[PDB]
Amino acid sequence: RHMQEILDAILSGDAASADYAALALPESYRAVTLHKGEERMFDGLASRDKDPRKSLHLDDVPLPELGPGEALVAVMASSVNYNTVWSSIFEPVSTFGFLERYGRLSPLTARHDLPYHVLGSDLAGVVLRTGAGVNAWKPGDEVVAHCLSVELESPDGHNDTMMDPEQRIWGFETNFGGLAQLALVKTNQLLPKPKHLTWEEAASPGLVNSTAYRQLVSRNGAGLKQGDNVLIWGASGGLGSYATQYALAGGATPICVVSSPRKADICRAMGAEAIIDRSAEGYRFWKDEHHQDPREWKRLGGKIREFTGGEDVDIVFEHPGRETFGASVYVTRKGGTIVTCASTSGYMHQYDNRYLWMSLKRIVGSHFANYREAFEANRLVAKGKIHPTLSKVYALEETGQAALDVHHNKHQGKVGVLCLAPREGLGVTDPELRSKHLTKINAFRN
Amino acid sequence: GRHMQEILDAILSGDAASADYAALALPESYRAVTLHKGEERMFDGLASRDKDPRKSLHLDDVPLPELGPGEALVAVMASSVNYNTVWSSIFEPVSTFGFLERYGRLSPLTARHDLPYHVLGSDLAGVVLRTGAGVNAWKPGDEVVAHCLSVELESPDGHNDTMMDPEQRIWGFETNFGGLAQLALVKTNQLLPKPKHLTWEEAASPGLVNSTAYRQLVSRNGAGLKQGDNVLIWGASGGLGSYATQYALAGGATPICVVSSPRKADICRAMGAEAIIDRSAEGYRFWKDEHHQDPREWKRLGGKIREFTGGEDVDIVFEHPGRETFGASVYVTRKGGTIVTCASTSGYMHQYDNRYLWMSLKRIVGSHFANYREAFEANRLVAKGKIHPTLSKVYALEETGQAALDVHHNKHQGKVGVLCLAPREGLGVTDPELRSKHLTKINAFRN
Amino acid sequence: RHMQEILDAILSGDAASADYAALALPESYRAVTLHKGEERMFDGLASRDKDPRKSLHLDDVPLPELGPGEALVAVMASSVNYNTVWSSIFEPVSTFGFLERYGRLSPLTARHDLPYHVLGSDLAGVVLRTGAGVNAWKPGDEVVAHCLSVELESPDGHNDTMMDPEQRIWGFETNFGGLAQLALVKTNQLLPKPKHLTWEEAASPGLVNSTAYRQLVSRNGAGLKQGDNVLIWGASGGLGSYATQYALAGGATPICVVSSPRKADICRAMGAEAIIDRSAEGYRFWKDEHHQDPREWKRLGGKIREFTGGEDVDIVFEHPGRETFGASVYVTRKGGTIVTCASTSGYMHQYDNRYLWMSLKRIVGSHFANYREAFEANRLVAKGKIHPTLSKVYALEETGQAALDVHHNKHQGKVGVLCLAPREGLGVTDPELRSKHLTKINAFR
Amino acid sequence: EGRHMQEILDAILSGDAASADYAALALPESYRAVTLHKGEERMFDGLASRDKDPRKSLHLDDVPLPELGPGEALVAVMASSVNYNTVWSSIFEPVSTFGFLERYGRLSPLTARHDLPYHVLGSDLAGVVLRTGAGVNAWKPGDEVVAHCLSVELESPDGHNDTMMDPEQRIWGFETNFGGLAQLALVKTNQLLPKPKHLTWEEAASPGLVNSTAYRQLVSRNGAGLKQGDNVLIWGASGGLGSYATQYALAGGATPICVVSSPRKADICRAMGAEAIIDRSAEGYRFWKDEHHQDPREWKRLGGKIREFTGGEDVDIVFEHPGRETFGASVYVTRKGGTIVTCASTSGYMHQYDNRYLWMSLKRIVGSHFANYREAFEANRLVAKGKIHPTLSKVYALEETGQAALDVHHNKHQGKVGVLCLAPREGLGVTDPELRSKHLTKINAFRN
Numbered sequence A: 001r002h003m004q005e006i007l008d009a010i011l012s013g014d015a016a017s018a019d020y021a022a023l024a025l026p027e028s029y030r031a032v033t034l035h036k037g038e039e040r041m042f043d044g045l046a047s048r049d050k051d052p053r054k055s056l057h058l059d060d061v062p063l064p065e066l067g068p069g070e071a072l073v074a075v076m077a078s079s080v081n082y083n084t085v086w087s088s089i090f091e092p093v094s095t096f097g098f099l100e101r102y103g104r105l106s107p108l109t110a111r112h113d114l115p116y117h118v119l120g121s122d123l124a125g126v127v128l129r130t131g132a133g134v135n136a137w138k139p140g141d142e143v144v145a146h147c148l149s150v151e152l153e154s155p156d157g158h159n160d161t162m163m164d165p166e167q168r169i170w171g172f173e174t175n176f177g178g179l180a181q182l183a184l185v186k187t188n189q190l191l192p193k194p195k196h197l198t199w200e201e202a203a204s205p206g207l208v209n210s211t212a213y214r215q216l217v218s219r220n221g222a223g224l225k226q227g228d229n230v231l232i233w234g235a236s237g238g239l240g241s242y243a244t245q246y247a248l249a250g251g252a253t254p255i256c257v258v259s260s261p262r263k264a265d266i267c268r269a270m271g272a273e274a275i276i277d278r279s280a281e282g283y284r285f286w287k288d289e290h291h292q293d294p295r296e297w298k299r300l301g302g303k304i305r306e307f308t309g310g311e312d313v314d315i316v317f318e319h320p321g322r323e324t325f326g327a328s329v330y331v332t333r334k335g336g337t338i339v340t341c342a343s344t345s346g347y348m349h350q351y352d353n354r355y356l357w358m359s360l361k362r363i364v365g366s367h368f369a370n371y372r373e374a375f376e377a378n379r380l381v382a383k384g385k386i387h388p389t390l391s392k393v394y395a396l397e398e399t400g401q402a403a404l405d406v407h408h409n410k411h412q413g414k415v416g417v418l419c420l421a422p423r424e425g426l427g428v429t430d431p432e433l434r435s436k437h438l439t440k441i442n443a444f445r446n
Numbered sequence B: 001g002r003h004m005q006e007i008l009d010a011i012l013s014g015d016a017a018s019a020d021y022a023a024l025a026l027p028e029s030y031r032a033v034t035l036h037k038g039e040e041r042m043f044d045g046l047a048s049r050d051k052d053p054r055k056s057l058h059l060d061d062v063p064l065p066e067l068g069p070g071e072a073l074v075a076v077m078a079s080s081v082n083y084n085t086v087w088s089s090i091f092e093p094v095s096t097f098g099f100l101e102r103y104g105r106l107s108p109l110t111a112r113h114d115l116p117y118h119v120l121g122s123d124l125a126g127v128v129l130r131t132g133a134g135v136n137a138w139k140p141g142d143e144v145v146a147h148c149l150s151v152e153l154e155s156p157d158g159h160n161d162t163m164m165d166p167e168q169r170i171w172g173f174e175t176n177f178g179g180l181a182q183l184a185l186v187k188t189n190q191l192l193p194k195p196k197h198l199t200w201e202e203a204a205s206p207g208l209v210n211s212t213a214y215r216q217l218v219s220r221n222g223a224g225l226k227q228g229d230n231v232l233i234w235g236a237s238g239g240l241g242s243y244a245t246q247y248a249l250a251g252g253a254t255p256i257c258v259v260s261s262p263r264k265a266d267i268c269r270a271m272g273a274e275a276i277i278d279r280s281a282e283g284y285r286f287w288k289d290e291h292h293q294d295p296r297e298w299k300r301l302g303g304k305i306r307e308f309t310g311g312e313d314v315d316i317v318f319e320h321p322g323r324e325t326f327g328a329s330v331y332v333t334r335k336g337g338t339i340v341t342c343a344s345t346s347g348y349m350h351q352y353d354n355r356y357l358w359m360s361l362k363r364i365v366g367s368h369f370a371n372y373r374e375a376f377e378a379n380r381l382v383a384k385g386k387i388h389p390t391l392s393k394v395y396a397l398e399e400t401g402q403a404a405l406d407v408h409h410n411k412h413q414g415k416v417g418v419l420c421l422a423p424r425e426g427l428g429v430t431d432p433e434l435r436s437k438h439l440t441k442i443n444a445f446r447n
Numbered sequence C: 001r002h003m004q005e006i007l008d009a010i011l012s013g014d015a016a017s018a019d020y021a022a023l024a025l026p027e028s029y030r031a032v033t034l035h036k037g038e039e040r041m042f043d044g045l046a047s048r049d050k051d052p053r054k055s056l057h058l059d060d061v062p063l064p065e066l067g068p069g070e071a072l073v074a075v076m077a078s079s080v081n082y083n084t085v086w087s088s089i090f091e092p093v094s095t096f097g098f099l100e101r102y103g104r105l106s107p108l109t110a111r112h113d114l115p116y117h118v119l120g121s122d123l124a125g126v127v128l129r130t131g132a133g134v135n136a137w138k139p140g141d142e143v144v145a146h147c148l149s150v151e152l153e154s155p156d157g158h159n160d161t162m163m164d165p166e167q168r169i170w171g172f173e174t175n176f177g178g179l180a181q182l183a184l185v186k187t188n189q190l191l192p193k194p195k196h197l198t199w200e201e202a203a204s205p206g207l208v209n210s211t212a213y214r215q216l217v218s219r220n221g222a223g224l225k226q227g228d229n230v231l232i233w234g235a236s237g238g239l240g241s242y243a244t245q246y247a248l249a250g251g252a253t254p255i256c257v258v259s260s261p262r263k264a265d266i267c268r269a270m271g272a273e274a275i276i277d278r279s280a281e282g283y284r285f286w287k288d289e290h291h292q293d294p295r296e297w298k299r300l301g302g303k304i305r306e307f308t309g310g311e312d313v314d315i316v317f318e319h320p321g322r323e324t325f326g327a328s329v330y331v332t333r334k335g336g337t338i339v340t341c342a343s344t345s346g347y348m349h350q351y352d353n354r355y356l357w358m359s360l361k362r363i364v365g366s367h368f369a370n371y372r373e374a375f376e377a378n379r380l381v382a383k384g385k386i387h388p389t390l391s392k393v394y395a396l397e398e399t400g401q402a403a404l405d406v407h408h409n410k411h412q413g414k415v416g417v418l419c420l421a422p423r424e425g426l427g428v429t430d431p432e433l434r435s436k437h438l439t440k441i442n443a444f445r
Numbered sequence D: 001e002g003r004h005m006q007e008i009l010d011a012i013l014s015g016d017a018a019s020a021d022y023a024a025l026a027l028p029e030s031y032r033a034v035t036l037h038k039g040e041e042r043m044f045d046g047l048a049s050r051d052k053d054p055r056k057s058l059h060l061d062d063v064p065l066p067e068l069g070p071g072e073a074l075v076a077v078m079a080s081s082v083n084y085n086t087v088w089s090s091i092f093e094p095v096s097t098f099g100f101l102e103r104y105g106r107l108s109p110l111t112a113r114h115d116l117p118y119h120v121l122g123s124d125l126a127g128v129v130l131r132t133g134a135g136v137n138a139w140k141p142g143d144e145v146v147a148h149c150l151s152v153e154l155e156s157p158d159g160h161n162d163t164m165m166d167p168e169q170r171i172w173g174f175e176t177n178f179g180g181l182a183q184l185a186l187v188k189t190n191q192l193l194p195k196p197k198h199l200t201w202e203e204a205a206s207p208g209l210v211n212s213t214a215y216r217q218l219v220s221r222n223g224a225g226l227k228q229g230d231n232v233l234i235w236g237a238s239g240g241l242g243s244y245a246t247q248y249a250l251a252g253g254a255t256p257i258c259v260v261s262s263p264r265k266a267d268i269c270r271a272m273g274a275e276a277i278i279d280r281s282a283e284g285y286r287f288w289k290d291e292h293h294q295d296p297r298e299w300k301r302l303g304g305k306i307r308e309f310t311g312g313e314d315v316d317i318v319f320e321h322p323g324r325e326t327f328g329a330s331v332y333v334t335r336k337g338g339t340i341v342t343c344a345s346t347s348g349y350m351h352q353y354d355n356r357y358l359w360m361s362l363k364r365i366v367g368s369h370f371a372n373y374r375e376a377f378e379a380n381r382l383v384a385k386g387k388i389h390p391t392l393s394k395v396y397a398l399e400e401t402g403q404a405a406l407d408v409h410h411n412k413h414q415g416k417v418g419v420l421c422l423a424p425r426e427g428l429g430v431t432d433p434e435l436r437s438k439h440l441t442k443i444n445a446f447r448n
């Protein structure tokens, strides 16, 4: 196999750039895919009852043609993200609609408009080829990838690339994602691999760490400062496992919300002290399908004040959506910020605008991160200031079970996936820095 | 009263010096529009609509209050009747006497406001007569208007933007000695210089809705308007929206004005706007039923906006109607744009589709009234002739009851003013050249 | 002649995109060029004595090959600015040095490394062909260009592309510039042509306009708001003339500084009213080569207050540098901003920091403009809020004389160049908006 | 030592006086204070600033109590500190403070109380409220307080969106009278903050001025707006401002590059948690080659040394205050897009820099000055929470304030130099012993 020869080169440890440039490309690669003819297979079911194991296929797919500004990457490991779940249950809409619309832009984007969709929005691996116009990256470079896909032909994105009208998420709104043995990315998605981490560890921060960085740290989100109090929903999940770290390292005080004593213990291991278990408290923010209960908003606010000495939070880190959003707006301090990048429990938000306008609060929408933000987030991992939060690793063939874990909220931290890597534990080339941080690196491990 | 008449004579002469005002003997009573503590339940049982301010508002002669540190006594030439004045006059949401009594427990200074009568009114235009201890920047004779937000600023919270202060009082509503009277008492950090090209009644008009619109649309605490922006303005001929339309035009931006009648569209054209949507003629139905919205109506509004902008979506939505329009407001905003909100007239339980907010990196910014720097800047743009008052009708002080009913029942398209000491309309202009340049717009809301 | 038929299509006014796509390309185009062998010809001379008429050639050159994300444009008009003049006299160094070094990177970048250099960093014209991947532009589109190109391989420029470490000015650090019948640009340099302007007027605002927009209007510079008072140095020059217009269009008050009565008249024709003639006032901000005179800073401040009713300016629009900068910091209001994008009179600035910290002022550096700011500035021209400042137009064959005119500061406004356009005055397709603004459009004629 | 003053101190020291007990104490008719005299403001004319001796101009006087006004408090001062503005005052540089008092005195009959032939100095205090004026409801006799030094009238609209912008804004004890280097002081009640209970009187007095300033300059959005990951060049990292700036950089998750002039100060920086330390004396930087011209080669040498510590990165922020000597280098070494934030010019206020580095690299120079009440509250809250620690090195008696000021004038100190006012000895005033115990090693990091 051409693919076995590629893996052997990576595992040897002493292949030069010219060696990678000399390997023959395989004619197909193994990939986790959706099929277009199945996009209605879950019609009539409740979201909970839609099973990613039924929709996710392991296929052999042809290599796409390499274009200008792009790189072909040999993927050692990837991760399950919530967009992998959304894709796999075809909610809110089918990703094939996104691929069809993308394919209308040009003959190059039309490569993506296929009857199958290779998923995955994270990777760690090795560059094999680069297209025309690519100088910064070369075959053999060890990389991780962020998932922003921007074309930058329009002027709109030249003062923050998230504002590009053609901005997409790689592996979700584009094809050739990371849950596969090979991937195709733009080279402006590439970042240097953290040397003290294994392949699966290095693949795990990309998406959620970059998003948490823009949403909480950067001036394009909440602009955290030391001394702030920050309410962090889902503090032991993917986003929250990085948000909590940024709050603590930035000198702020996180109030972490989780739903089990096991996750509460992890938050204490990260260094948080103020932890609310929403299951034990039994919050019912909605009385029925159409009306909320302000008494329950107020009970949450009172519990926060027990931890802060009577202070309300400067920032709410939102993402659960409809269930929690009325409470989030209510409990925020006068002049404070609710920053939101998601709506897991439902995107039709309801809130009492009297609390927003009379208290001069703001709701800031945030979405992934631009390259500069993704670089800064990955830099803090490489410096050993922010740590990966991997809890469990699955084989590529078992990506469906990994997606079901997240779908049903059975996990903590990040769930990783081995792609070409034959086992866990490979890829560390800075053992001294790894040993300095190993206890924190393994804090989420089962 | 002889002393009061001599004060008015000094003002009307046009050439009294500061020393002359300092030498005028103060009156020992002044005429004022008041509520009476004994009557606060006279409307119990009735619907808001059927409560009549002519039955609760009294014309009384009241004694002058003692002038404290950092305060000014003002001879009032004109004032205004706004929604806060109307609600007070019908003891809604609760009687104003409740707060005057509680706050009056703090100190002998706060207890001056706790009286069996309440002098209403949160606007004035007039002349400073006396200042209390420590005052530097104002002197007898200075011609002034007032910002009605009073802050004590003992908490640190308000020292980077005073709207964050936790202890605000609206003068004439949560304080006594308001402006619907011949004299008023205010803090000197409420005073603003009178625009010289306007009459007394015009200068008292812009008031809180003008500074609120300025903070919401122009200032960096709100939307931070820049030239070239497209701005969707709901209620563009009402209080807030009329000033927002003017700020958009004055700042080099394009307002897309929304109104509900052809008469209102004509007022918008008179202010200088060109892109006008009649929401009633278009028949928008943003809610399908009590609990669900219709995204195809959001998109129909979006397509109508694009007809005026050459295919562009708005950088800013100037919100205030609330529940009925808020879903559409979030939908139509450009990627990276801002929805600024300072009220919820149609209902405060907002519902919107958050996918549009996070996937297009939009933000919803809450704003409320204005701090004193914003009020100074808004008033300064009126004084420069960039922003014009919106007066429709003027009443004498003796007829404040009817003025209040007119506002309560929405009888006029623009503001209702009240003459206090001024004997007739049309006095107080000392810059006729500037007035002549802007006369048509100044009178756009007169019939 | 294939070139003649391209011009006839443009002049017909009703060719469709399919008609442009069907036209045969010419094998060569007429271009204004420098020659590699002559780069030492002005060795020994003072700058003022170098004559661009001796170095600029009119050549027929072959068409370059069209790469990914590029467009081939038929050029109706161009401009001559200071970058063009500097290149034509090989200052500060010959432009061929950078073209050679950059052309080592790849076959794409080596297209630019030729023995001749086609100059010009402005255009107005019609798209003829686009390279692969191009979505937003098609044959027939009427365009102007933003001259600053970025590669954006580094993350640094992905929150504001001016932070990118590898910028190139098209026609100066690239070949195939706009002083020619055809040009090659990236598609993320293209902007829609303002319909109410002639070809030569549309090509004129260019980089000084977008630089002024970034410095004064955008949040990356001073963040102007209506009501502000703005001190504008050099108010009838390139930057200052656009800055004056942005101040007015944004509802602010420019306090315009000029050095002659004729310049004051031009400021009044633009709409300004508060004008200071620094030469009539006789300001001497420096007492000698090393020390300033705070009494003269204060004298300027007092003159400003005569126009503002006693207020100090919220913003100073700086660019003269050493001579004026101490005065600029002094006169700015408490909490105000001094924004700077050049140092004409000298880059070693000196100022009294007590005024800066005790009055919480800031000095903000700005440079050129990113593509979003260039689009917004061009859009305000297209709205008729901002007007071009052309003084004189030359034919392409006379580009040498045009460059000498700019080099010796012969005109008060800009110098334009007809490329394919056979005469001035063509290209207006919005005559109603033009008629509204004709007097201001011609203020520098 | 008068009887009424002795009775006030006995009440404080008893630990159990009630608010009504302080209200009932007789006030003294005079108090002991460190003062300047108007007749002497020319005494150093023609001398180089280094040769001006604060021991010659600072007097210990008995002065009459001023009349209490609306919005004010009379405070019994247990301890204060020397600040550099105490040094500036005592050498009448750049100008005499009596010009400031004369100008202030023209505003109103209330501000005219300050226009006196002597100037009571001091811009920090820790102590106990004795009396409050009209309009004061938030503070009462007996409250244990520290004071920040912002004096704002807030009559003008300009200060109502950040009070530092008030046109009449002044620094208490420098541009106003009745400062804190004295047994009693007069302040606006909007200068008052709750005393941190785990600190002694002298420790609690020491952060106010420089900690508030460093917070606005580095942490707040009105200054540099620090974020975790930033590299920050901190001049004078073991002095007053620097000893707080370094703590904010570390606690905010940034990397300070600390500049000091001795190995002893380098060791304190390491004890604070910094690793990247430059000794400007050992490096021998000569940024100026003569009176009128700088040396870009030395700017470059500093920039190269910084890059050795950061792995090749240039600093996002420079925390400036030395002024003329360093400012050209500070602008040069800053990263593209970065910020130089300045609140002072110790070495000379006529700054010179190369504007090509500022405009071509899109840098900005942000002027900062003290802090508004909200920022001062936030800075003091972080001390009270034990997140930021006092940096007191040495304590002098009130009668030795002249020598304390000379220490700072000649750059012989580290951290903050404290002064006992009414407090009879060091070590008093702690009422949270368990929080103190948790943090004691860091609290004492600067002690001789």
Ligand SMILES: CC[C@@H](C(=O)O)C(=O)SCCNC(=O)/C=C/NC(=O)[C@H](O)C(C)(C)COP(=O)(O)OP(=O)(O)OC[C@H]1O[C@@H](n2cnc3c(N)ncnc32)[C@H](O)[C@@H]1OP(=O)(O)O
Residues within 6 Å of the ligand: A081, A082, A083, A084, A086, A091, A092, A093, A121, A169, A172, A207, A342, B299, B300, B301, B302, B303, B306, B313, B331, B332, B333, B355, B356, B359
């Ligand atoms: C892990 C990474 C990350 C990720 O993976 O993300 C995440 O985990 S995140 C959570 C997962 N992600 C989601 O959960 C949501 C997926 N995505 C969607 O759910 C839909 O995508 C959305 C609701 C956002 C929009 O859907 P859509 O219905 O497609 O939107 P819209 O209406 O904007 O556009 C269609 C037509 O409306 C026109 N149009 C637009 N604006 C106006 C206007 N103002 N006026 C008039 N017409 C207008 C356009 O011009 C078009 O016209 P056409 O071009 O002729 O079709």
Ligand SMILES: NC(=O)C1=CN([C@@H]2O[C@H](COP(=O)(O)OP(=O)(O)OC[C@H]3O[C@@H](n4cnc5c(N)ncnc54)[C@H](OP(=O)(O)O)[C@@H]3O)[C@@H](O)[C@H]2O)C=CC1
Residues within 6 Å of the ligand: A081, A082, A083, A207, A208, A211, A233, A234, A235, A236, A237, A238, A239, A240, A257, A258, A259, A260, A263, A278, A319, A320, A323, A324, A341, A342, A343, A344, A345, A366, A367, A368, A369, A406, A409, A413, B358
């Ligand atoms: N815009 C963007 O770019 C990004 C958006 N997202 C979106 O953010 C959301 C979370 O992503 P991720 O963190 O990766 O997923 P995870 O599932 O790993 O973390 C989600 C956490 O949310 C909490 N949670 C779930 N449902 C509720 C609820 N109804 N009420 C309160 N808390 C709840 C759980 O914590 P517990 O049960 O312990 O309280 C869980 O750990 C998803 O919707 C995802 O699509 C993600 C990343 C990028």
Ligand SMILES: NC(=O)C1=CN([C@@H]2O[C@H](COP(=O)(O)OP(=O)(O)OC[C@H]3O[C@@H](n4cnc5c(N)ncnc54)[C@H](OP(=O)(O)O)[C@@H]3O)[C@@H](O)[C@H]2O)C=CC1
Residues within 6 Å of the ligand: B083, B084, B209, B234, B235, B236, B237, B238, B239, B240, B241, B258, B259, B260, B261, B264, B279, B320, B321, B324, B325, B342, B343, B344, B345, B346
């Ligand atoms: N808290 C306080 O102290 C005060 C609060 N307020 C609040 O501010 C709000 C606005 O103030 P102001 O502008 O002075 O009020 P106005 O009554 O002057 O104008 C309100 C406009 O809102 C528009 N509007 C109302 N309902 C809807 C709707 N359902 N959909 C769309 N547009 C609508 C109408 O415009 P059209 O019909 O022409 O489209 C109406 O003219 C007030 O309604 C009140 O709630 C006001 C003053 C004081």
Ligand SMILES: NC(=O)C1=CN([C@@H]2O[C@H](COP(=O)(O)OP(=O)(O)OC[C@H]3O[C@@H](n4cnc5c(N)ncnc54)[C@H](OP(=O)(O)O)[C@@H]3O)[C@@H](O)[C@H]2O)C=CC1
Residues within 6 Å of the ligand: C082, C083, C208, C233, C234, C235, C236, C237, C238, C239, C240, C257, C258, C259, C260, C263, C278, C319, C320, C323, C324, C341, C342, C343, C344, C345
């Ligand atoms: N880096 C680059 O690639 C480019 C840099 N630049 C730089 O930008 C600067 C300005 O560009 P532009 O506006 O187009 O130049 P202009 O020549 O068009 O206008 C410059 C104006 O500055 C004013 N000025 C010059 N010297 C002084 C002085 N000592 N004191 C006061 N005012 C002075 C004059 O106005 P008046 O005499 O009327 O008061 C003069 O008109 C150029 O001078 C150059 O340094 C420009 C082009 C490109």
Ligand SMILES: NC(=O)C1=CN([C@@H]2O[C@H](COP(=O)(O)OP(=O)(O)OC[C@H]3O[C@@H](n4cnc5c(N)ncnc54)[C@H](OP(=O)(O)O)[C@@H]3O)[C@@H](O)[C@H]2O)C=CC1
Residues within 6 Å of the ligand: C357, D083, D084, D085, D209, D210, D213, D235, D236, D237, D238, D239, D240, D241, D242, D259, D260, D261, D262, D265, D280, D321, D322, D325, D326, D343, D344, D345, D346, D347, D368, D369, D370, D371, D408, D411, D415
């Ligand atoms: N605007 C405001 O509100 C405030 C302004 N200031 C001003 O800030 C400055 C410092 O205040 P503070 O920190 O209290 O004083 P300190 O003397 O305690 O600290 C100053 C430090 O600067 C360093 N330093 C002194 N001179 C030079 C020089 N020429 N070059 C380089 N480094 C130098 C020394 O460190 P080393 O020798 O170890 O390098 C010294 O420790 C003063 O000018 C003061 O007035 C202070 C506080 C508030």
